[PDB]
Design a protein around this ligand. Structure first.
Ligand SMILES: [Ca+2]
Ligand SMILES: [Ca+2]
Ligand SMILES: [Mg+2]
Ligand SMILES: [Mg+2]
Lengths: 199, 202
């Protein structure tokens, strides 16, 4: 089988509230202001597909949220994003591969050239056969093309692929291609699913 | 009672391996190198007591670890430190205060003027009556003076004071003053300690 794992809130817990915290710390903008104004716009989508620079992205979000930050200060806060490994999942992924299933990561990512980000974590690189990243591909979930890219480059069909994502639109994109798609509701979803599959 | 909580590996999980990671990512220095060269000596202690600047600290660590980083890049990676709340511990601290106990944080801190650090987290500021920080005091644990400062400022005696910290040297400095010191071995030490306090009422 081909197993495709999303990264954020699938392999790792990730919380951008910590970034808002960090930017609130520097700017003294009340945290509640940054929460009501931090939105997943087109600038996000473009930056995910690598279509605009890190600097242009910073500029977009700063204008949206009225952040008087330099690029460097922006990045500095960006770096604070809360990331915690789910070791249960890293282990399952290693086990799937030593049983000779194929295990890849597929991630929409807003990494910057100046930040250290989860797809760069050694524990995540060593758990995966390949890591597919939106900025590298010029594509993002839930666009058909990105799923197709992975199917094609891995050499598997939809019916022979299972995909895990905590985002329902992402799941929908994969389903339209007849990929088996498991919504990740919580910590248990992947351990439960692989109870009977590893045995 | 007066409750003194340490911050790191008591109220929060903290892991500076994430910082070494971020620095390996920028500098391309092998991680294993930064692990062998990253030591908590003199410049740390000075910086904890606010006795050298952030920049002079950054400089001291970059000298020892051969990091070709600006101050900004230092701070940038410093900021990556892994920090996870322990919500059970936050809940206890709140419960203790609405029972009328006095709940404070005492922390040796290597915060920089450019970083967002756990003592600044709103969840932590609001769980505690006061937060005592080494850089502010010009003192660090396990120096007698820092424990004395808190007993004096709070107006409590050693025997009315319970202190939680994961570092054994810290536990010793507080024991030398007859403070009831509880070594935090893991995430159950503090839930357990307070279950046994609850169990003692009738
Ligand atoms: Ca990087
Ligand atoms: Ca700060
Ligand atoms: Mg996700
Ligand atoms: Mg500690």
């Amino acid at each position: 089988m081909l197993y495709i794992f999303d990264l954020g809130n699938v392999i790792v817990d990730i919380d951008f509230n910590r970034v808002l915290g960090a930017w609130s710390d520097l700017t003294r903008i009340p945290l509640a202001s940054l929460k009501k104004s931090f939105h997943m716009g087109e600038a996000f989508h473009q930056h995910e597909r690598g279509e605009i620079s890190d600097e242009a992205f910073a500029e977009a979000l700063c204008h949206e949220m009225a952040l008087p930050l330099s690029y460097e200060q922006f990045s500095h806060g960006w770096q604070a994003v809360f990331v915690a490994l789910r070791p249960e999942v890293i282990a399952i992924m290693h086990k799937l591969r030593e049983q000779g299933h194929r295990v890849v990561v597929l991630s929409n990512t807003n990494r910057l050239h100046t930040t250290f980000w989860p797809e760069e974590y050694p524990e995540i690189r060593d758990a995966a056969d390949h890591i597919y990243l939106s900025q590298d591909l010029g594509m993002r979930k839930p666009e058909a093309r990105i799923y197709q890219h992975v199917l094609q480059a891995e050499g598997f069909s939809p019916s022979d692929t299972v995909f895990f994502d905590d985002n329902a639109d992402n799941i929908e994109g994969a389903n339209q291609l007849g990929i088996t798609s498991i919504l990740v509701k919580d910590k248990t979803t992947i351990p439960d699913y692989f109870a009977k599959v590893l045995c």
